[PDB]
Write a protein that binds this ligand. Structure first.
Ligand SMILES: [Mg+2]
Ligand SMILES: [Mg+2]
Ligand SMILES: [Mg+2]
Ligand SMILES: [Mg+2]
Ligand SMILES: [Mg+2]
Ligand SMILES: [Mg+2]
Lengths: 285, 264, 314, 126, 379
RNA sequence: GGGCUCUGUGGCGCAAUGGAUAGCGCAUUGGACUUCUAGUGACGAAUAGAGCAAUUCAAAGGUUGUGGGUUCGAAUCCCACCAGAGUCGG
């Protein structure tokens, strides 16, 4: 058959003013330290009831904004971008691209700005909810869900995340008193030394974003950005760890910038970074 | 009978009463991955949607707690009446906020009218001494997080492999589902443990106030465990004060557990 | 042959080596049921004093286990005596653990206790209200010997040549030790290559059993300093074919990274790369080291909220 | 150390794994001498092809079951359950849960003990 | 000024030559000796500034001094009877070794600075050669040795008594480079050269029966504590010494008697009351004079050669560290390696022409191209 | 070098308003750890290190770019300048 899905709470006029004169103070997560055994009489129950009643009020909160602080946008799904209907604001110094005389955004930038309350996204003359925006923009043709999660996580801390355009790149050893025995026969290769021909298997993991530190936000040149801070590849926590061939390929591609891996474990983001290492042995001690 | 929306395999909850009902009745907790309408520049606390693992969603569908559906698409047949209703709603919400602000201005004016007239008369006296000496952007709009329109979705059949439910049939999902189901029947709470080098975190109670006691690691009854995995996992359990719990389902249906601890 | 340089020994121990210079002393070891042990005193204390090799059997770090009791020292510290002052419990175990082999020597119950009741008249001071000590003769030998791992043994034999392994009173060669150690340990080549590479640079490697890793690298030794690196080894090809011995997930790597940052160490990954042109019969010779490379990779954890400024060091 | 009586007892069980009997003798040494236990007997298990030690930490307590394993071996969970049941029937008492100690011994004789019981055990406190 | 001395039996005339003076000694009547060298009657012997001399008589004599002495006096208190008895016991060991086809006595003389070690060595050697023996003199004193220049260790085969003025005739000494006036700069090198001298002495004893039966007398450094004591034990072992003569130091006697093998005869002897303490400056002057005597001979009888050596023609090392020829080499002594064939001093260095000028006891070319730089300078 | 649009708030990323209290997060400092680890000690032993549902709590931090204007009252509305980013065109 077909199931009916009722949804949405329409904030009234009086419920938008109360949501505009809101606070900014985050409620404390656990009111004190955590317990060990679940056997209690009233302390456990009361503290749990409090911790739960604060949560069920924190989540039932809507975004309310002014109609003049909102940059009206429009999602064009055949060209694959969101085209602004007004001059952008402060986010135009690190986000967006201008082509053919109009200001344009990628889908993930548009979604991130919709969550932060920066743009007022539309589609077929009707504004997109955050549910419908999550549904429309987060396909596999445009940008996935794990990639948007990592992009948003980094952007909410003040980084500059830019799509990676592939065109961007008595302790002796023996009795004799001698020095520097040098018994080594094993030579130490490097990471990119031999990865120009390892690119022939172009498939699997690939660089996605370019990340700039939070310092560089103030003087970010969007047409001559410079060498970034790190390049980012995005996986899931159950996908396999990259082999040495994939490591050498991504390192050769990235070039001189360090490479970072963003794992997403059912909603938890964890960043690792494989870096080549060689230590000039020891001294005379 | 709640409603979960499944799209390409991921299950998200977009309501608040649904998350409250889940947590306080069925013992499922999920993870909030969204942003906060009050804290949109931090990663400390997050908001809706709530992301349910595939095992949580299958478990809730089996016992009859939720009705999985598949993300609807725009009708495209009922669109013009939507526009008419939207224009009417927008104009009414815009023309009724003009009253609230006016009455609030009246209250504030009549509240601090005496300091205003104080400063006024004081500046008038200063003037006497000197003479003797000489709509839009103010109209609020809501960016909803759950679709404000009722849409018919077709019910998803989870016990078959498809495009919008790729899990049914895979061995890892069946293993994790057996262990998750058994642990959930025992009265525990569960979450994900990637940082802790395992599969689940088992709580004596609600994880807001209680701390996990075990790290659960789902295994196949015949898969070979490297002993170094055991040593590293036991050391991580000792470092954080959690027992390492091993789980594997038997052919007769029941699961067998084991606890690994340190000794001297 | 190609084993040492200055004062190059042979694979066979016998014979002169043209060494009219500072004469050292090569050390001896015997392979007892797939383990290597050395018994001579100065050899033990110097193998542990030189390069920090091996580990004593009973004692934790060094070969410093004594029969004496740490508790019974504090009762009569003052009197000018020597080491052995033991309790009568282990002496009662010292009584019978020899007496049973006395019965196993074929002689019957008539004397088994009388040989020992006379033997309670190379020596120990078993002490006994008054606690008296009557010097006892040692019934059963409790000698102490050092034990070396396979990789350290082969490093001293091949790369250094001052160690000699025995087998039924017969010293063995280099390639026979290679094949024997590969038989008893199906992963001797890889771990020995990693060990040789890391020790040739002055570092001191020790097994990382307690942390779940493969090796632990000490700057100057366990007493001098602590370990700085934990190593995880594997073997691959020049076009990177090969199955890793322990398959690495990322749960394993999260766990290892956590429990290594806790003990303040660095989690390294050491890949060994050999040519695709390699054979299964040229590799069985230790000379195969020259055609295989090494590559290290430090796996660390990037904390998102800490790296968004640059200095902030005042 | 080959002349030690208990070593003869271990190789008397007719098992046939010299590496495992040497590992088991190393664990016997580490328990009896260093950690100073009492009444440590060696008893085999031919139904699982194992050699195992029984002992008593403090005289007057219950018997402990310690099964040594080298670092190259590996244990399916079915083998763990098999050893649990075997040890339960070995020591005798069915009141206490099924448990045993896993003494992992590396080449240089460094032993790590891990206590595998059956069920849910609270970590440090209970 | 002329002074005549009448010496009774078993007495000695002790005298010291004043700075910048020379004193002539003449035996007029009877019999007398200087450190076991017999004096010829009516022969004048000349002693130069800083000479310290003891003229002993077993039977009585008349001696004449002509010149200015800082001090001159007759002493009856002398250890000469104990030194004679020591020599007589060593001669019994030589006669026994001759009869049994064995090696002769290896004698090590030990004790602190300024106890007469080199004087006792000279006396024991002189008495041995007077009895027709041919002992090897071994010199382990790198600071004040008499077999070669300072900074060296060596051996000399003694065929005749020492000359009264010049000392032992230096004919083809075995000499090794140590490079410094104290063993403390490189104790491993010092012990290594000590063992090498013992090995080459043993090889000489195998082919030369007369050297074997005669044995050796080993002079040692005055460094008797810490690593200096360990170097004496090393020398005793390396030479397989039969007799250790300890001068004026009971502590060292008891240490050596405890730490040496029971077959090693340790003897304590007093120093002579005529032993003079030597200042650091006097010791420096004696080193500079010994280096001068090497180039210029006894009283200037040699004419050393000055010539240029190219940097390309030689390899220079410090004990092996290669040394690049530089202006810092000026006034350093270099050993010419074959043992050492001889010594040269760098007098100047020309970096433009890549040459250094040397003073050499022999004309160009140098006999060998391997050079060892000393920490010792000669101007 | 010209025209147009946007921006400037604590060390950094940022909130705020009809126009009527200048605070959130990261970093910093300081506690508690129902904490863990590291040394050569057989009667809870001075010391640093690590902390991601073994985590948790607090304090401190201001040239609101500069000047002027309306206003009882300006981070907030307007004007000019200073600095920066994008675009168009020469
Ligand atoms: Mg501002
Ligand atoms: Mg500022
Ligand atoms: Mg700022
Ligand atoms: Mg925390
Ligand atoms: Mg104000
Ligand atoms: Mg202003």
């Amino acid at each position: 058959a077909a199931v009916e899905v009722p949804a949405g709470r329409v904030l009234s006029a009086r419920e938008l003013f109360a949501a505009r004169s809101r606070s900014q103070k985050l409620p404390q997560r656990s009111h004190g330290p955590k317990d060990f055994l679940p056997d209690g009489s009233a302390a456990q129950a009361e503290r749990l009831r409090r911790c739960r009643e604060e949560l069920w009020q924190l989540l039932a909160e809507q975004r309310v904004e002014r109609l003049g602080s909102l940059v009206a946008a429009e999602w064009r799904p055949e060209e694959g971008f969101v085209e602004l209907k007004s001059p952008a604001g402060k986010f135009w110094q690190t986000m967006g691209f201008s082509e053919q005389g109009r200001q344009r955004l990628h889908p993930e930038e548009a979604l991130y700005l919709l969550e932060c309350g920066s743009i007022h996204l539309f589609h077929q003359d009707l504004p997109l909810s955050i549910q419908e925006a999550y549904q429309l923009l987060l396909t596999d043709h445009t940008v996935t869900f794990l990639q948007y999660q990592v992009f948003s996580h980094l952007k909410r801390l003040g980084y500059v995340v830019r799509r990676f355009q592939p065109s961007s790149v008595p302790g002796q050893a023996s009795s004799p008193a001698v020095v520097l025995q040098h018994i080594s026969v094993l030579q130490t290769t490097h990471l990119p030394d031999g990865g120009a021909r390892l690119l022939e298997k172009s498939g699997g993991l690939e660089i996605i974003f370019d990340v700039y530190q939070a310092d560089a936000v103030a003087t970010f040149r969007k047409n001559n950005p410079g060498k970034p801070y790190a390049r980012m590849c995005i996986s899931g926590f159950d996908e396999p760890v990259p082999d040495l061939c994939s490591l050498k390929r991504l390192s050769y591609q990235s070039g001189d910038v360090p490479l970072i891996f963003a794992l997403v474990d059912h909603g938890d983001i964890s960043f690792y970074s494989f870096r080549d290492f060689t230590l000039p042995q020891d001294v005379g001690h | 009978m709640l409603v979960v929306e499944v799209a390409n395999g991921r299950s998200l909850v977009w309501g608040a009463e649904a998350v409250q009902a889940l947590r306080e009745r069925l013992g499922v907790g999920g993870r909030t991955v969204g942003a906060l309408p009050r804290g949109p520049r931090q990663n400390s606390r997050l908001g809706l949607p709530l992301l349910l693992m595939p095992e949580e969603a299958r478990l809730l569908a089996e016992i009859g707690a939720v009705t999985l559906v598949s993300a609807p698409r725009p009708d495209s047949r009922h669109h013009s009446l939507a526009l008419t209703s939207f224009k009417r709603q927008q104009e009414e919400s815009f023309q009724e906020q003009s009253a609230l602000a006016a009455e609030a201005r009246e209250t504030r004016r009549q509240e601090l009218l005496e300091k205003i007239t104080e400063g006024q008369a004081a500046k008038k006296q200063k003037l006497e001494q000197a003479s003797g000496a000489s709509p839009r952007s103010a109209l609020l709009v809501q960016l909803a997080t759950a679709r404000p329109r009722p849409v018919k979705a077709r019910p998803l059949d989870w016990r078959v492999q498809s495009k919008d439910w790729p899990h049914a049939g895979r061995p890892a999902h069946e293993l994790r589902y057996s262990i998750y189901r058994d642990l959930w029947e025992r009265g525990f709470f569960l979450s994900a443990a990637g940082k802790f080098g395992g599969d689940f975190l088992v709580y004596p109670g609600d994880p807001l106030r209680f701390a996990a006691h075990y790290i659960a690691q789902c295994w196949a009854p015949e898969d070979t465990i490297p002993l170094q995995d055991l040593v590293a996992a036991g050391r991580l359990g000792t470092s954080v004060r959690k027992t390492l719990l091993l789980c594997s389902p038997q052919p007769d249906g029941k699961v067998v557990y084991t606890s690994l601890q340190w000794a001297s | 042959r190609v084993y040492e340089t200055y004062e190059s020994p042979l694979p066979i121990p016998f014979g002169q080596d043209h060494g009219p210079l500072k004469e050292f002393k090569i050390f001896r070891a015997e392979m007892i049921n797939n383990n290597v042990i050395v018994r001579n005193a100065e050899d033990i204390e110097q193998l542990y004093g030189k390069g920090y090799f091996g580990k004593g059997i009973l004692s934790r770090s060094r070969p410093s286990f004594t029969i004496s009791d740490p508790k019974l020292v504090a009762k009569w510290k003052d009197m000018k005596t020597n080491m052995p002052i033991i309790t009568s419990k282990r002496y009662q175990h010292s009584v019978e653990w020899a007496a049973e082999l006395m019965r196993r020597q074929g002689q019957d119950e008539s004397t088994v206790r009388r040989i020992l009741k006379d033997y309670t008249k190379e020596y120990v001071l078993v002490e006994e209200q008054r606690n008296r000590l009557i010097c006892r003769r040692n019934p059963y030998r409790i000698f102490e010997y050092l034990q070396l791992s396979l990789e350290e043994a082969f490093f001293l034999v091949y790369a250094l040549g001052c160690l000699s392994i025995y087998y039924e009173k017969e010293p063995l060669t280099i390639v026979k030790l290679w094949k024997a150690f590969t038989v008893v340990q199906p992963t001797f080549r890889t771990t020995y290559m990693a060990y040789h590479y890391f020790r040739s640079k002055g570092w001191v490697p020790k097994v990382g059993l307690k942390y779940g890793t493969d090796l632990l690298l000490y700057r100057k030794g366990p007493p001098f300093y602590a370990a700085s690196y934990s190593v995880i080894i594997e073997l691959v090809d020049d076009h990177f074919e090969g199955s890793l011995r322990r398959p690495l997930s990322w749960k394993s790597l999260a766990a290892l990274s956590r429990v290594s940052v806790n003990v303040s160490k660095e989690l390294m990954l050491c890949y060994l790369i050999k040519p695709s042109t390699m054979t299964d019969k040229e590799m069985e010779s230790p000379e195969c080291m020259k055609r295989i490379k090494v590559q290290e990779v430090i796996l660390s954890r990037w904390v998102s909220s800490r790296e968004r400024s640059d200095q902030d060091d005042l | 150390m080959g002349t030690h009586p208990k070593y003869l007892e271990m190789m008397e069980l007719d098992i046939g794994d010299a590496t495992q009997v040497y590992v088991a003798f190393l664990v016997y040494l580490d328990l009896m001498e260093s950690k100073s236990w009492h009444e440590v007997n060696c008893v085999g298990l031919p139904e699982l092809q194992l050699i195992c030690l029984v002992g008593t930490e403090i005289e007057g307590e219950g018997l402990q079951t310690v099964v040594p394993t080298p670092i190259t071996a590996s244990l399916s969970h079915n083998r763990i359950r098999e050893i649990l049941k075997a040890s339960r029937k070995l020591q005798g008492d069915p009141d206490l849960p099924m448990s045993f100690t896993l003494a992992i011994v590396e080449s240089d004789s460094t032993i790590v003990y891990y206590k595998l019981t059956d069920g849910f055990m609270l970590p440090d406190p209970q | 000024p002329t002074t005549k001395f009448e010496l009774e039996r078993e007495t000695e005339l002790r005298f010291e030559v004043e700075a910048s003076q020379s004193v002539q000694l003449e035996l007029l009547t009877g019999m007398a000796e200087i450190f076991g060298t017999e004096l010829t009657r009516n022969k004048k012997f000349t002693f130069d500034a800083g000479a310290k001399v003891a003229v002993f008589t077993w039977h009585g004599c008349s001696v004449q001094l002509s010149g200015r002495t800082e001090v001159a006096y007759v002493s009856k208190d002398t250890p000469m009877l104990l030194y004679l008895n020591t020599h007589t016991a060593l001669e019994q060991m030589r006669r026994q070794a001759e009869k049994e086809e064995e090696r002769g006595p290896r004698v090590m003389v030990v004790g602190p600075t300024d106890v007469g070690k080199s004087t006792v060595c000279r006396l024991l050697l002189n008495y041995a050669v007077r009895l027709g023996r041919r002992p090897t003199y071994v010199e382990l004193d790198v600071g004040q040795g008499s077999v070669s220049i300072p900074g060296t260790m060596g051996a000399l085969y003694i065929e005749r008594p020492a000359d009264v003025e010049e000392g032992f005739s230096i004919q083809a000494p075995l000499v090794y480079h140590f490079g410094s006036t104290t063993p403390g700069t490189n104790i491993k090198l010092y012990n290594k050269i000590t063992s090498r001298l013992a090995d080459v002495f043993n090889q000489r004893c195998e082919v030369n029966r007369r050297a074997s039966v005669s044995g050796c007398v080993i002079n040692t450094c005055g460094w008797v504590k810490g690593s200096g004591y360990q170097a004496l034990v090393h020398a005793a072992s390396a030479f397989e010494v039969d007799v250790v003569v300890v001068l004026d130091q009971e502590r060292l006697y008891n240490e050596l008697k405890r730490d040496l093998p029971h077959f090693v005869r340790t003897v304590l002897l007093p120093k002579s009351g005529g032993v003079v303490e030597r200042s650091k400056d006097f010791r420096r002057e004696c080193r500079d004079e010994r280096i001068r005597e090497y180039f210029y001979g006894f009283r200037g009888c040699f004419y050393p050669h000055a010539f240029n050596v190219k940097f390309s023609d030689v390899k220079i090392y410090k004990v092996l560290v290669p040394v690049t020829p530089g202006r810092d080499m000026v006034h350093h002594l270099l050993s010419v390696s074959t043992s050492v064939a001889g010594f040269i001093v760098v007098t100047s260095v020309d970096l433009e022409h890549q040459v250094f000028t040397v003073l050499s006891p022999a004309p160009r070319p140098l006999p060998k191209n391997f050079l060892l730089i000393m920490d010792i300078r000669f101007m």
